[model samples]
Target: AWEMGVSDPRKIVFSAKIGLALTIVALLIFYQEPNPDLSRYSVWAILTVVVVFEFTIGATLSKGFNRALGTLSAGGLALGMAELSTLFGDWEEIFCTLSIFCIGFLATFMKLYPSMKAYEYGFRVFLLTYCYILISGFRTGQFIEVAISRFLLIALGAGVSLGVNMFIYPIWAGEDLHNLVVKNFMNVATSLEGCVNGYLRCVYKGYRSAVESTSQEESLMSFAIWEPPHGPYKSFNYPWKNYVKLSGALKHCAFTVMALHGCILSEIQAPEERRQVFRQELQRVGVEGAKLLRELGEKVKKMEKLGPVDLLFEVHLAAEELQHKIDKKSYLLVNSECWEKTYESASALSLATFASLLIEFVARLQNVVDAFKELSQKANFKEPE
Candidate 1:
């Protein structure tokens, strides 16, 4: 935890921003006192800034916007209740009781679906406004003025958080997400290299690490999904919903590579020389794929215009070619249909299966190609028809 704080300066910056917000609100209420009516609610402003900016800028903005709506709804309900209670002098207490129950009930009910939980915040806003109006005007009746004061204070806090986050050093969620996409995409390159060379000298040892990197990639997606499009990504036309879209495609690439590697590590029972000759061509493919992945990552990192200049691997065609070589006895191994030992079938089948899996791995990489294509399009690039 200590190391993380030291490593990530955002924690320190945000903490300082929070303190700044608090101090400003405090000064407005205590030293300035230009508007005494709203001064008492300054604390709400401080709290709003504190709460909204706690998350990433995009998410903070999202929450603050929703929260403001909630506050308004609450104020409206409270005002309506106050009016009803005033009109029905005898049933004043009854109206207030009903108002409290209804608002609370709505708040709780909306929170149940949880996906629509933002709405619950709206209802909760109503409850807060309702309670304030009820109490402040229990006998005096200054609902509108107090309500406006409350809103102004809350808005002050929210605006502070927004302004600081927006202009100060200005951390944008789009940047975080873009960096994540770059790193994970690079992982595919190294992982493909690892998987490819497996039918190599030592059998690429990075299989487990590749899997670990992918899982980590998905973890970042959760945060990325919450981030709104901003910064240079504005033209990317990315919405919050599609923020982590590449995660699924990348995960598929990762798992397919893993499967391809697994067959080599677990079941390739063929002899050393036999394995060597059959995989020589494929060894080339692995190196090529890894290079392409690295190029993809590097280009995306620089937000450069990408082309298929770095990409050219067809698993199906390669598989067919390899298969033809095996059928014509041009393959490195020599086996007779009538005299071959039955026990050798498993080894041969496993080797073939491993090659087939590699072909599948290459096919799946097309998904990554498409994913990167979409990302590349964000850079304003287009492939010629």
Candidate 2:
């Protein structure tokens, strides 16, 4: 039970078994003449002080407050039960019966509360109080002294638990946060890869189908052509904050792809002079799209490795892309009346809007990684060593 209750079973068992064996050896050292009271008070005092200090410090502020509340409630209930036992004289039977009833009543009633924290607090208090009351009956002859000794024991137990948790193998929130961010980024990357591959496959296969059906009758041609799988595009619509923001940012890039595609398509309907101009614009959009994709891919790789330098690199790249698009006056096309509504819709995606959000996400992720490093250093936990 002790091994099961303790956080690190091996360490707890080792410390306890070694201490017990040492105590037995020490007792044998003076087997001919014993001094039971030689260091009893000093040992108890040290245990009490250590436990109180550790119980307070090992916990976070919220946890400490909750524990304080539980202790106060439990201690009060135990004191009340102690008084009842004194008044009644038939302490043992009364204690056992009352303890069982109290345990059952609290266990059943506490769960009625909507607040899980309150329920837990009440349950702990009831259990501790009941245990203390039952134990009090067994120590009837030396009640006060044993109570004090037990208090010290409780404090010692708390100290040991806290010391192991905080100093030996502390779990840091920052490391958890870093992991979540990395997982989210990987999910974003996976979604982006799916989107790009799907878009390309659909365009390629759709074009081939159209070309193959061109010579058939109009009604027969419609029957002959089938839609390519665009399921990946539909699969990209996740509502998670990290992926949603990433998708929004990528959507702006998608608009640029559409604008470039439209420019290429317009070459078929344009005069020789206008055709060359549209072709140049089409090439420029493609180059910009490729650059953004390359930068995005590199940043995703850096994020996976938890590289600190890539945090700043991502921010700078987002800023440069925004500035470049804005400087070229491409956003003006979004409001232009010359193009169809679909063209206007495609031009509405501005890099500045989503780029800022991406920068913020990268910055937050970097801060989490830094905090994890600091926590690991404090706990003497070396990732490499």
Candidate 3:
């Protein structure tokens, strides 16, 4: 039976964040009774909370830290720039514009690369500081209090965001990453199954839909990649790095399946005699790989280990069948007398190559399964390590 009336997870987190922010806003409004000058900057705290609160706890944490660090540091640099403008007297506008352009140009460059995202934090921070410097009358007058208020408000927002995320129904990146990995495995397995089984007429079946589902899984991987390592692995800095490697491996496995599908489709289109040999072999190999993937995906979804895998038996059978064909081909290549023989020999070799890729893919997929199983082991507590 289901519980009704806002039984969804993290219901308390949302309420606490918004409630505390609004409560503080109200308290300051009624009790503190700020004048016009004070009101100019105090409203920034509310804005900070609004912008910093992300849907997920890790996301909120990442945003709050970046913003707080950027804005506060930028405020300091912006003040320095303002102090430098005092040396320029009436030419402060020129100096300000030049500083903005030089900084903006550098920041824009840093934002171009995926690995350079830390610079993005500094970029936005510097911009906030520079804008405030210009607005502060180039240090001729004092607006240090205003700048400090903005910095404090941003830091306060970070604290509030972290507090709500931790004390409320917190979401960990580790859990989400594992869940997404399992989901990707399942979707890719569906794709591989449909492709392998319905090679010639996949359009009639759900192959197209399965392929689309795999496409949707791409963003899930990306989101999981961003999640900082949390939960039991907080001290382990590169804990999530293995998951990234697993995602890469999963993607490679998917690529191998697609290649295998292409090989199977080609085999299906081959001449009758050639088709008989190629189709059944590839089909057997494909089914075994896809079945193993789906089974392991199920295990991963349930946070369990791959128990007594019999897929390896089927894979062994596939290897013997392929090896026997390879031996027969050696005799044919020696007895070749025409282009037909040469072409058939060439095609057969490529098919074997594709089969090899399929096996490699399945092997790596199993490796990732073992990786996740070991990581999720401790979480069970009662489960033997």
Best by TM-score, which number? 1
Candidate numbers, best TM-score first, in rank order: 1, 3, 2
Candidate 2 has a TM-score of 0.38
Cα lDDT of model 2 by residue, 174-292, tens digit:
33222333343333333333333332331323222222322222322222122121212122321123322343343333333233233334422212332232233223333433343
lDDT of 3 at 62: 57
Q: Which candidate would rank higher by lDDT, 1 or 2?
A: 1
Name the better of 1 and 3 by TM-score. 1
Backbone Cα, N, C clashes tallied per candidate: 1, 0, 0
| Alpha carbon lDDT at 304, candidate 2 | 28
**Model 2 bad stretches (over 4 Å):** 1-68, 88-103, 117-122, 138-142, 168-170, 195-385
Worst 10 residues of 2 by lDDT: 224-233
Summarize candidate 3's per-residue lDDT along 1-385 as a digit string, tens digits.
Answer: 1363358646565666677866776576566655666666666766766777766665665555566576667667777787787788878789889988887787678787898754575566657666766676544578777565666766675576567656766665567666766666667766766665664332222233333444334434434445556554444343445555556656656666666666655643333354444566667766776677777666656545445445467766785786677566554223345449557556645544554675566566556555556555534423323
Q: TM-score per candidate, in order?
A: 0.74, 0.38, 0.68
Ranking by lDDT: 1, 3, 2
User: Model 1 TM-score?
Assistant: 0.74
lDDT of 1: 0.65
Clashing pairs in 1: 74-126
Candidate 1, poorest ten consecutive residues by summed lDDT: 235-244
